[PDB]
Amino acid sequence: MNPSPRKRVALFTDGAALGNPGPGTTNNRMELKAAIEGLKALKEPAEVDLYTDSHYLKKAFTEGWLEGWRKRGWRTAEGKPVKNRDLWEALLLAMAPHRVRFHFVK
């Protein structure tokens, strides 16, 4: 009963988008914030089909250079530190137990 892997979760990264700054990148961060929580508030190794229609989250994973990021000491394609590196480094540590899948629903 239920998926055969472990447990597939349909998590829709639907933060809100209204930060004092504005969706200008907070929504993505908020969706990112909800993610770290959506993967830390479980700790149950599951195939989370995280649907993220963000231009930051997708870009990261879709660039597959996330591995490079680690070898890049964590900087931007320009050479300046990465923003949210705290959420990420935390989400990454929290994404280790899970198989969390990426589904850019744009």
At 13, which CATH number? Answer: 3.30.420.10
Chain breaks in the chain (C to N over 2.5 A) after: none
CB neighbours (10 Å) of residue 92? 15
- Local structure of residue 101 (DSSP, 8 states): E
Q: What angle do CA 77, 82, 87 make, to 5 degrees?
A: 140
Alpha-carbon span 23 to 30, nearest angstrom: 9
- Local structure of residue 15 (DSSP, 8 states): -
Strand bridging mode 101-103 / 49-51: parallel
**Count of helices and strands (H, E) across the chain:** 4, 2
For the chain, how many structural domains are there in total?
Answer: 1
DSSP structure string for the chain: ---SSS--B--B-------SS-TTTHHHHHHHHHHHHHHHTT-----BEEE---TTHHHHHHT-THHHHHHTTSB-SSSSB-TTHHHHHHHHHHTSSS--EEE---
Tokens of 78: 């320009």
Domain carrying residue 10: 1-106
Residue 14 among known ligand-binding residues? yes
- The structure's method of determination equals NMR
Cα dihedral 38, 39, 45, 46 in deg (nearest 10): 40
Residue 49 among known ligand-binding residues? no
- Local structure of residue 14 (DSSP, 8 states): -
- Give the 3-state secondary structure of residue 96: coil
Residue 89 among known ligand-binding residues? no
CB neighbours (10 Å) of residue 70? 11
Sign of CA dihedral 53, 74, 84, 100: positive
Alpha-carbon span 57 to 94, nearest angstrom: 15
Write out the E strands in the chain. 49-51, 101-103
